[PDB]
């Protein structure tokens, strides 16, 4: 299973962000608002979660052979991931998620504060003009082989377009001592 593909718990669905390693042990990053739901996932057991304030969570794979260090492009191909980086305003980026597949756009702001109402407030989010829909959360924000973020939320949809916010992946990797595969 690669970045952008579906991960579920009971009737809930989110997307995998990036497969990573913690001291050689295969894990998967996704959104914290997703991991808050349950400890039991289709791919394994949750070992960390942080939402709101932040929006990241980590799951240890039941099957280490499934930790595919790529992003699925929804056209039968995958993008290889090799490093993690920080986004910059104007960067050309792509997002992969299980509801809308692959979409592209550019980073329009950094360190955005996002008020999700009853769900709470998140800080330090990457802002883009890429659309997303429910189910896309946790999926991959990347530029070529560089991982940048995890889909958190936004406004609009993929028909009318919208604004989306992402948790910077570097903060999630350092929270857990992980490295992208």
């Amino acid at each position: 299973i690669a970045g952008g593909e579906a991960i579920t718990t009971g009737g809930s669905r989110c997307s995998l962000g990036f497969n990573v390693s913690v001291n050689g042990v295969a894990h998967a990053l996704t959104a914290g608002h997703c991991t808050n739901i349950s400890a039991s996932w289709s791919i394994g057991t949750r070992t960390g979660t942080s939402f709101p304030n932040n929006d990241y969570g980590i799951i240890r794979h039941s099957n280490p052979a499934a930790a595919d260090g790529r992003v699925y492009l929804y056209n039968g191909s995958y993008q290889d991931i090799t490093t993690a980086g920080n986004a910059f305003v104007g960067q050309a980026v792509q997002r992969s998620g299980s509801t809308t597949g692959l979409r592209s756009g550019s980073v329009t702001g950094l360190n955005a504060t996002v008020n999700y109402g009853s769900s709470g407030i998140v800080y330090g989010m990457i802002q883009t003009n890429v659309c997303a829909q429910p189910g896309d959360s946790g999926g991959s924000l990347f530029a070529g082989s560089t991982a940048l973020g995890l889909t958190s939320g936004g406004s609009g949809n993929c028909r009318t377009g919208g604004t989306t916010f992402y948790q910077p992946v570097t903060e999630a990797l350092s929270a857990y001592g992980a490295t992208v595969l």
């Binding site: 959104a31 608002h33 929006d55 998620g97 509801t99 996002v114 008020n115 999700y116 109402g117 769900s119 997303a132 829909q133 429910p134 189910g135 896309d136 959360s137 889909t151 958190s152 939320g153 936004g154 406004s155 604004t163 989306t164 916010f165």
Partner: peptide, 4 residues
């Protein structure tokens, strides 16, 4: 905005 809302969480997806």
């Amino acid at each position: 905005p809302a969480p997806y």
